Amino acid sequence: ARTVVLITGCSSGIGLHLAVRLASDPSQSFKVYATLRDLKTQGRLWEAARALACPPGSLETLQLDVRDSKSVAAARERVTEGRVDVLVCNAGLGLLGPLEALGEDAVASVLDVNVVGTVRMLQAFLPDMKRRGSGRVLVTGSVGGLMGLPFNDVYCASKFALEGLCESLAVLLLPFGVHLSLIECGPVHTSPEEVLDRTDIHTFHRFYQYLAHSKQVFREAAQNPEEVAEVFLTALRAPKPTLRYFTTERFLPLLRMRLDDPSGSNYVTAMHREVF
Amino acid sequence: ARTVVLITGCSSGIGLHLAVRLASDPSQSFKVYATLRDLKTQGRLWEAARALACPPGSLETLQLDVRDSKSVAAARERVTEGRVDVLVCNAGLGLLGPLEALGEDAVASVLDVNVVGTVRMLQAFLPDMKRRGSGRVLVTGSVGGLMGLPFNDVYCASKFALEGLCESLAVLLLPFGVHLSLIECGPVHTSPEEVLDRTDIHTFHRFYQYLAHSKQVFREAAQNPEEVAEVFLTALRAPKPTLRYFTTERFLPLLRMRLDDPSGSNYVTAMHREVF
Numbered sequence: 001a002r003t004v005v006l007i008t009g010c011s012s013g014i015g016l017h018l019a020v021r022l023a024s025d026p027s028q029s030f031k032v033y034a035t036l037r038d039l040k041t042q043g044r045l046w047e048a049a050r051a052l053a054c055p056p057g058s059l060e061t062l063q064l065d066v067r068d069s070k071s072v073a074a075a076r077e078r079v080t081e082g083r084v085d086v087l088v089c090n091a092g093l094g095l096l097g098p099l100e101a102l103g104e105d106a107v108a109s110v111l112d113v114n115v116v117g118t119v120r121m122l123q124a125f126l127p128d129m130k131r132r133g134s135g136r137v138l139v140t141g142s143v144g145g146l147m148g149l150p151f152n153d154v155y156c157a158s159k160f161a162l163e164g165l166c167e168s169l170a171v172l173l174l175p176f177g178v179h180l181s182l183i184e185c186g187p188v189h190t191s192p193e194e195v196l197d198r199t200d201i202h203t204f205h206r207f208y209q210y211l212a213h214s215k216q217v218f219r220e221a222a223q224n225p226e227e228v229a230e231v232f233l234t235a236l237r238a239p240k241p242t243l244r245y246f247t248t249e250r251f252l253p254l255l256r257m258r259l260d261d262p263s264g265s266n267y268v269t270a271m272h273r274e275v276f
Numbered sequence: 277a278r279t280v281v282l283i284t285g286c287s288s289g290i291g292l293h294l295a296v297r298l299a300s301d302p303s304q305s306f307k308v309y310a311t312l313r314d315l316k317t318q319g320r321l322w323e324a325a326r327a328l329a330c331p332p333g334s335l336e337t338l339q340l341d342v343r344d345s346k347s348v349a350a351a352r353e354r355v356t357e358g359r360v361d362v363l364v365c366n367a368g369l370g371l372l373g374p375l376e377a378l379g380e381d382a383v384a385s386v387l388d389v390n391v392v393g394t395v396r397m398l399q400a401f402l403p404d405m406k407r408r409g410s411g412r413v414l415v416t417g418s419v420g421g422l423m424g425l426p427f428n429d430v431y432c433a434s435k436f437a438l439e440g441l442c443e444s445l446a447v448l449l450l451p452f453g454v455h456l457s458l459i460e461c462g463p464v465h466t467s468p469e470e471v472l473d474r475t476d477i478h479t480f481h482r483f484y485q486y487l488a489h490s491k492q493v494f495r496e497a498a499q500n501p502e503e504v505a506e507v508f509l510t511a512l513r514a515p516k517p518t519l520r521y522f523t524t525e526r527f528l529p530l531l532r533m534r535l536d537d538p539s540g541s542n543y544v545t546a547m548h549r550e551v552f
């Protein structure tokens with residue numbers, strides 16, 4: 001049949017726009033299972049594939065709570081072609097704030113969702129692909145998994161993790177014929193008493209400047225889901241794909257400053273200059 | 277008054293050797309609180325204490341379980357001096373196997389201990405260090421935080437995360453007079469049924485091949501913890517502390533060839549060759 005594709009975080013954003021893109025393909029090439037934590041909020045999504053003349057059943061919607069591996073497992077059992085050719089690990093959470101401000105539950109949910117959720121998926125699906133000797137797996141990365149961002153300490157922790165996880169696997173799955181690629185996004189588009197009370201005067205100031213500077217870079221350089229979604233195809237279709245794919249070239253310079261000096265000294269100074 | 281040092285995971289290895297090295301420094305500069313998950317395992321440490329002759333009072337132990345933020349606050353409370361000049365986030369866990377063989381609680385145990393653990397510590401101790409405008413935090417890093425290694429997927433994920441968490445904080449922490457540095461360690465000194473069934477046959481061979489090479493490399497490469505602890509010392513004293521310190525040159529060129537190929541596929545082969 002088609003190349004089967006299962007994707008996570010299809011509610012809003014990237015996962016949504018990529019789900020529709022592959023379903024609607026001029027080839028009719030890819031059967032898509034989009035997955036959602038609330039199956040109800042698939043309103044957003046079904047319009048923009050009815051909208052695009054997505055052929056007889058090119059888009060299926062399953063419920064997948066990445067925090068829970070029974071839910072991951074039901075989802076595999078209810079993929080009735082009994083393979084996956086393309087796995088997209090996209091669900092993710094952000095956590096912005098001063099570290100000592102952040103709720104412990106919030107900290108663990110970001111890890112559980114960003115990192116462990118992705119481990120569940122690869123646990124559930126990855127054996128089948130190795131059994132076979134082909135399969136592709138695509139993980140929504142972040143430039144914040146590649147370099148550290150003030151006040152995104154955990155989010156970044158969480159995306160560095162994915163790199164770690166994916167790079168280690170990649171090394172093992174070289175001779176197996178299974179392929180693994182990270183898609184590294186810059187930004188993309190879709191308390192003050194409390195903050196002060198849970199930190200100090202100096203951090204509070206730095207948080208709000210970071211925010212201004214952040215809102216700024218968002219407006220000069222935030223990409224849109226469908227662009228990002230293109231880089232996924234570019235890597236699906238790739239004959240022999242690479243471990244990474246960058247969506248913009250805009251942070252190659254800051255990155256090269258980090259790769260220049262492993263002591264980390266140049267990068268810390270730079271990025272602090274950049275931000276404040 | 278002495279420099280107040282608080283160190284997690286002093287049961288053994290690096291943190292045991294670091295706590296005693298500091299307690300017995302001829303300067304008698306250091307007041308060390310050596311923490312352990314379980315107080316019953318503090319024997320080797322005390323053998324080691326009077327053995328290097330740490331003076332009376334240079335060393336006390338505390339129970340501290342980095343999984344539990346109440347255990348973190350109880351400990352912080354036992355710092356009689358009411359301040360911490362040097363924090364050493366060293367507690368750590370390993371996890372070695374095919375990803376799909378690893379169990380769910382284990383996978384999470386590691387993140388919770390290696391990553392969240394370090395967050396709780398930093399959450400409970402950075403506030404005072406920022407108020408004072410002084411403080412050093414040292415974090416036990418790994419080769420596996422810098423480059424992925426087959427069959428250490430979750431281990432490396434948890435160590436990539438510290439790189440992330442640490443770098444992001446360091447970008448914020450530079451105007452505050454609080455220094456955070458990572459001590460990047462290579463290897464350091466001090467069922468098969470189950471594994472076959474939870475994975476495929478070719479993986480199985482690759483695992484005991486890895487293991488063979490991994491024991492192979494622990495004989496040609498493993499440093500004394502004495503050597504490693506001296507690197508922590510150097511970082512502590514350094515007037516201009518950099519974000520990373522490496523205890524060895526060995527793996528630096530794998531790190532370089534990793535760094536100048538952002539695509540990542542050179543590193544991937546390089547490491548596969550190295551290993552199999």
Ligand SMILES: C[C@]12CC[C@@H]3c4ccc(O)cc4CC[C@H]3[C@@H]1CCC2=O
Binds near residue numbers: 150186217
């Ligand atoms: C830190 C940053 C603002 C916030 C950006 C940000 C925030 C969230 C995210 O998922 C990705 C990115 C891309 C890089 C970040 C910028 C680099 C230069 C700058 O000032």
